[PDB]
Design a protein around this ligand. Structure first.
Ligand SMILES: [Zn+2]
Ligand SMILES: [Zn+2]
Ligand SMILES: [Zn+2]
Ligand SMILES: [Zn+2]
Lengths: 470, 472
C-alpha cells in the first residue's frame, strides 16, 4: 500500500503495543531506529521523543520544522491486528491507532526518506496525549530548535485547524443517606440504544445524553406523581468522561401496583421518541424486575439527587460569535456511579477561552452548594487561540489548494489538541494542524480513509518542499 | 394621513388617534363596529369581546372560498393618544410605542372592507382581544362562529417572509424566600450593570445577546465562591422591566465589611473578562459601583448564598435548537424581571417551545431548581404553538403572489415567538392558515418603527391573494 514508507511505518506502529500508558516499547524502538540512521535522538524528563535530521541539499537556509504527533492510542498491552477494508483500514475488533499513528508514521517516513526536500527537521513524539496530555504539559522548553510546528493530529481531509478548545475535568459528589428497605417492589428503569459520540466534536449535534434523559424522567415522575411512593436504590450511566453516554439505569423500590411505574415509563418513552424521532432512532426504555436490596436511599436523598442531576447543566453553553459554526463553551457528563455514601458524576468542561471554563465551573459550584455536594476540578489544559497571522498557514493553504484543486477549509475544533499546551511552552513557534480523514476515533469503529492519507502525504511533503528562508 | 395606500394609512392614522393599549381596547372596538354598521356590514362581538365583521364577495368572486383576515386590537404600552410621524421611509411614534404591531395589519383589513374596487371573496375580518397580555381574545374566541375556510393572520413583521408556524409559551414565576438580619456591616454599595442591548426574548434568543440579570448573578456567584474572606450580604436585588424583553440593566445592593477596594477590584476584573467575552455582541456594557444609603435590615448570609446560587444556575436562553426545521430555536426561556419584595425574591420568566413537551421539560427543570433552593414555581399563561400544516393551498397562493410582487421567492419560516394562530387553529382546525405582514422593527420597544415601502408591498401581496383565492 502506497506511500510505502508511511504505511510500512504504520504497520510497524501497530505491531508494537502502545496504549495510553504502555508507550515505552514504541518509544524505545523509534529511538533505536533513529540512531541506526545517525539521527540525534533524545527523550525529555517526561519522556517525549525528539529526533533531528539535517536539511536536505538546497534546503539549508530554510526555517527548521518539527512534525509533532502523539505516541499513544486509546485502548477502548497485547498487539494490534489491522486489515484493508475497501478504501479504509481498521483494527480487528478494537481501536486501530490511526489517531495519531498515521501522523506519526508520516513524520518517520520523512525521516527515513532520501528523496524528500525538507529543511532542518525535528520530530517530536509526545507522551500520554490521550490521558491528560502529560507530554505536552511537561515538554522541556528551550529544547526544540524548530521555528514551525506541524501538528498531525487533525482527522479530516481538506481541513486545516488553527485552534482548539481547552478542557477541565469536573467531578460532582452528592452524599447518599440510606434507610432500611421496607418497600414492596424493586424494578430498574433501563435506558439504552442512544447514538453516543465524542463529547467535544459531537456536542453541537442534537444527540442526547442518556444520563440526563433518565434524570428528566425521574424528575417528572417525582414532580407529577406525588402518590407514587418510591425511592432510589441506586443510579448509574455512561462509561467514559469524554464519551456521550448511551446507556443509563436507575433502580427503584416502590409501593403499589407496578403498572403505575410502567405507565409513567411508557408515556415518557412515547414523548421522548416524538421529540428525538430522527436523532435517536434506537432509544429504548425497559422496566426490569430485580432483587430487593436491604438498604435504599432516603426519600430526601432521592429528591436531592434527582433534582440536582436534572438541573445539572449539560451540552452547549455558548456558541462562538467570533468564529463561524463553532461551539465556544460546552460541558458533558459522561459517567454516573453510585458509590458507598456518594453519587459521583464525571464531566468534561470545554471552552475555546479560559473564562468560559471558569464560568461553567462557577455554575457547577453553585449547583453543588444548593445541593450540598462538592465539585472537584482537575486536568485543566489551555485551548489553542488562532494566531493573529501565520506564514505556515499561508503556505499550508497554498499547497492544500494545489493538491486538492479546491480551497481547503480553515477551522478551529471543539475538542482537545496539544497545540495550546505546546504554544504555551513555545510561544514563538508558528503552528498548524492537519491530517487525513479518520472516522470514529477513541472507539472500535476507528477507520482511516486510504486515499486521504495519500493526499495528506502530498500536502505534507509539498509544504516541506517549500518552507521559506530564515 | 398622507401616504399610499390611502385607505390603510388613513385607517392606521385613525387607529393611532384612539388610545388602545392592551386593556383599554373598548373605544377602538366600538369605533370599528359603529363604522362597520354605517357601511351596512354585519358587525358583532363575542362573549370575550373579539370583533367579527362580514362583507359579501365582490362581483364575480361569489364561488370562491371565504376568507377571514385576522389582527389583534391591542398594542403594548411599554390611556392618552398616539403621535406618529414620517421619518424617512419609516413611521414612528413621538417617544413611545407606535402600535404598528398589530395596527397596520388591522388597518389593512379595514381598508379592504372599506374599498369598492378590490376583488375579494366572501370576507371576514376578525379582530382579537388582548393578544399582548396572554392572548385572552384568541383563547376565548367563539367556536362555529367564523364562516371562513381560510385565515390570513397579519401579525408577521418581516417583508418577503411567510410564517407557517410558531412557538407556544408559558409564564414561569420563581419565588425564593428572604430571611433578614439587622444590618451591622460597615459599607453599602450597589453593583450597577447597564448598557446591554436587550431584545425580544423570542425572536432574539438565538443571538449571542446577554441577559443583564444573569451577568450580575454570574459576578456575584464568582465573588462569593472565590473571595471567601470578602464579608458581604445582599441588601436587595433587581433587574429588567418586562417578562418577554431581554434585560438591559440590573442592580444588586451589597453591604460589606473591610476595604471598598476589594469590591472595586472584583468588579473591575469581572468587567474586563466579560468585555473580552462579549466584545462584538455587547459594546456598551458598563459596570459601575455606587455608594448608597445603609439599610436597617439586609438578607441573611444563608439567604444571600441561596439566592445568589439558585439564580446563577437558573437555566436561561436556548435550551434546544430544532432538528426538523432549519435555523429555528425549538425551546428556550428568558428571565425578564427580577425583584426583591417583602419576604421573597421574584423571578419572572417566559418559557417558549414549538412543542408542548419542550415547555413542560423546562417547567420540570425550574421545579427541580426550586426544590433545591426551597422556593416555588407558579405557572400561568400557557398557550399552544402553531404546528405547520402537512399541506396548505393558501400558502401556495401566498407563495406565488409574493414571488410575483417581489421578483424573488419569499422565505417560508416558522418563528420562535408567539402568534395567535396556534390558539385559532385549536378552535378552528379545518381553516387553512398563514401569516404575513410588513417589516416592523423593535415592536414592544419605544423604538418601534414600520418600513413604508414594505407596507405598500404587503398591500399588493394581500390584495393579490384576495384577488386570486380559488373556487370552493
Ligand atoms: Zn485521540
Ligand atoms: Zn490525537
Ligand atoms: Zn407584539
Ligand atoms: Zn402582534
Amino acid at each position: 500500500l502506497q506511500p510505502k514508507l508511511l504505511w510500512q511505518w504504520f504497520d510497524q506502529i501497530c505491531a508494537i503495543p502502545h496504549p495510553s500508558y504502555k508507550e515505552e516499547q514504541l518509544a524505545q524502538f523509534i529511538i533505536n531506529w533513529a540512531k541506526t540512521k545517525g539521527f540525534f535522538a533524545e527523550r525529555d524528563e517526561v519522556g517525549n521523543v525528539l529526533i533531528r535530521k539535517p536539511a536536505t541539499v538546497g534546503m539549508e537556509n530554510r526555517k527548521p520544522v518539527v512534525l509533532q504527533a502523539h505516541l499513544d492510542m486509546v485502548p477502548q498491552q497485547d498487539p494490534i491486528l489491522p486489515y484493508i477494508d475497501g478504501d479504509w483500514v481498521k483494527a480487528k475488533g478494537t481501536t486501530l491507532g490511526a489517531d495519531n499513528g498515521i501522523g506519526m508514521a508520516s513524520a518517520l517516513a520523512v525521516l527515513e526518506s532520501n528523496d524528500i526536500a525538507h529543511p532542518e527537521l525535528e520530530v517530536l513524539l509526545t507522551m500520554t496525549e490521550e490521558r491528560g496530555m502529560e507530554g505536552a504539559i511537561g515538554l522541556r522548553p528551550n529544547w526544540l530548535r524548530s521555528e514551525i510546528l506541524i501538528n498531525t493530529d487533525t482527522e479530516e481531509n481538506g481541513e486545516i485547524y488553527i485552534g482548539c478548545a481547552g478542557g477541565e475535568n469536573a467531578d460532582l459528589e452528592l452524599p447518599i443517606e440510606y434507610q432500611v428497605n421496607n418497600f414492596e417492589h424493586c424494578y430498574q428503569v433501563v435506558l439504552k440504544g442512544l447514538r453516543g459520540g465524542h463529547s467535544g466534536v459531537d456536542i453541537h449535534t442534537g444527540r442526547a445524553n442518556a444520563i440526563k434523559v433518565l434524570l428528566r424522567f425521574l424528575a417528572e415522575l417525582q414532580q407529577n406523581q406525588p402518590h407514587f411512593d418510591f425511592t432510589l436504590a441506586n443510579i448509574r450511566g455512561g462509561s467514559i468522561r469524554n464519551a456521550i453516554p448511551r446507556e443509563s439505569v436507575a433502580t427503584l423500590v416502590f409501593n403499589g401496583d407496578i403498572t403505575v411505574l410502567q405507565s409513567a415509563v411508557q408515556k415518557f418513552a412515547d414523548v421522548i421518541k416524538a421529540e428525538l424521532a430522527l436523532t435517536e432512532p434506537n432509544l429504548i426504555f425497559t422496566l426490569e424486575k430485580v432483587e430487593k436490596p436491604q438498604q435504599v436511599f432516603s426519600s430526601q436523598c432521592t429528591k436531592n439527587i434527582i433534582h440536582c442531576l436534572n438541573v445539572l447543566p449539560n451540552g452547549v453553553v455558548r456558541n462562538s460569535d467570533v468564529i463561524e459554526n463553532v461551539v465556544e463553551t460546552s460541558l458533558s457528563i459522561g459517567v454516573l456511579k453510585t458509590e458507598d455514601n456518594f453519587v459521583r458524576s464525571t464531566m468534561l468542561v470545554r471552552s475555546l477561552i479560559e473564562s468560559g471554563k471558569s464560568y461553567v465551573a462557577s455554575l457547577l459550584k453553585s449547583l453543588a452548594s444548593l445541593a450540598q455536594g462538592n465539585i472537584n476540578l482537575s486536568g485543566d489544559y489551555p485551548g489553542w487561540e488562532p494566531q493573529s497571522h501565520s506564514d505556515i498557514l499561508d503556505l499550508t493553504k497554498t499547497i492544500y489548494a494545489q493538491v486538492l484543486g479546491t480551497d481547503p477549509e480553515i477551522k478551529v475544533i471543539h475538542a482537545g489538541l496539544e497545540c495550546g499546551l505546546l504554544k504555551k511552552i513555545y510561544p514563538t513557534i508558528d503552528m498548524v494542524s492537519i491530517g487525513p480523514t479518520i472516522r470514529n476515533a477513541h472507539s472500535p469503529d476507528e477507520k482511516v480513509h486510504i486515499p486521504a492519507v495519500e493526499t495528506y502525504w502530498k500536502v505534507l511533503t509539498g509544504i516541506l518542499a517549500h518552507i521559506p528562508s530564515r
